[PDB]
Design a protein around this ligand. Structure first.
Ligand SMILES: COCCOc1cnc(N)nc1-c1c[nH]c2ccc(C#CC(C)(C)O)cc12
Length: 335
């Protein structure tokens, strides 16, 4: 019956210009499962032709800009009829999670990558989204070694707005870190990408994240103790991860890596939070604010909105955003 299912069946076997809600629905079918070509497209700039949107036929990836993404899944692409250019993320069908789209579909904080659509074709789900010419934050830190305190403070702030947005839409991101924040061309704007590890929350219990088939975990070095202990998990998980990213930006390396060899998860469980990785150099309110995000107990840890306030204050005290985004290389901190 479900009136709902009737709408979803109306979507199957084709790709159509449609809305977020349609994409969102049709996506959930993909998580549950010439193997069809189907999907929905959110801009007119990416246009299906005769019920179809096939790679190399209707759209072409640019041979060759570099593949970005952890698995080199992200590519520059072009619509062959329209001439409009954007990014694709490839996700293998048999591990596609509908949360990835839920997290960016439609209503748009500017701290969340714009989703331009998705179509499935064969063993792939192709996700289309605005090309952000600025690159990843992770690229930035690698090119600069590590970042000036004001820049790091500034990007942490814009990630936190994005998180605040998702946490209000009741989705947690699950793997926040520099590689999953994208920059605008001038470096002035950050938005989150890579919602492949996102999860939703319900009334309010507080799901234990890992343990499950469904769930693949975030970056080990950035995971919160309640994740690793197999405890109850919620949005606070992203505020821990975001402070690990902060430490990344300052020191030019991930937390933990420089002190223990592995497995690192046990150390995150057994040991005090890596506040000893805060540079002494830093302003009181910077340190203070990282301290408050790296509380091992998520009930005690600051929310994303709360932390955001603290960093905007730490940005005042350090003297506003002054340093250019691409200046001198800065020596990473040594072991
Ligand atoms: C390494 O930085 C190069 C610049 O890359 C990008 C540019 N523009 C966009 N939209 N995404 C990216 C992008 C890079 N890596 C990624 C990893 C994951 C995703 C994603 C995603 C969704 C939103 C589909 O979950 C996008 C990207």
């Amino acid at each position: 019956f479900s009136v709902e299912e009737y709408l979803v069946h109306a979507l199957q076997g084709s790709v159509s210009s449609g809305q977020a809600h349609s994409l969102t629905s049709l996506a959930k079918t993909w998580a549950a499962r010439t193997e069809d070509n189907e999907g929905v497209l959110l801009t007119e700039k990416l246009k299906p032709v005769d019920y179809e949107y096939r790679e190399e036929v209707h759209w072409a990836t640019h041979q060759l800009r570099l593949g970005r993404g952890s698995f080199g899944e992200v590519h520059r692409m072009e619509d062959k009829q329209t001439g409009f250019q954007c990014a694709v993320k490839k996700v293998r069908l048999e591990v596609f999670r509908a949360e990835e789209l839920m997290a960016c579909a439609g209503l748009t904080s500017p701290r969340i990558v714009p989703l331009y659509g998705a179509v499935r074709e064969g063993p792939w789900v192709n996700i289309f989204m605005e090309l952000l010419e600025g690159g990843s934050l992770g690229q930035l830190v690698k090119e600069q070694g590590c970042l000036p305190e004001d820049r790091a403070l500034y990007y942490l702030g814009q990630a936190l707005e994005g998180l605040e947005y998702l946490h209000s839409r009741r989705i947690l991101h699950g793997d926040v870190k520099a590689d999953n924040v994208l920059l605008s061309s001038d470096g002035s704007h950050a938005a989150l990408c890579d919602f492949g590890h996102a999860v939703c929350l319900q009334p309010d219990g507080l799901g234990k994240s890992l343990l499950t088939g469904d769930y693949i975990p975030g970056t080990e070095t950035h995971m919160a103790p309640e994740v690793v202990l197999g405890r109850s998990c919620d949005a606070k998980v992203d505020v821990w991860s975001s402070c690990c990213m902060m430490l990344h930006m300052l020191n030019g390396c991930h937390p933990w890596t420089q002190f223990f060899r592995g497995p690192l998860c046990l150390k995150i469980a057994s040991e005090p939070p890596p506040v000893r990785e805060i540079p002494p150099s830093c302003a009181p309110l910077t340190a203070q604010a990282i301290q408050e995000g790296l509380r091992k107990e998520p009930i005690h840890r600051v929310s994303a909105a709360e932390l955001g306030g603290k960093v905007n204050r730490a940005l005042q005290q350090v003297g506003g955003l002054k340093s250019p985004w691409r200046g001198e290389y800065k020596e990473p901190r040594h072991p």
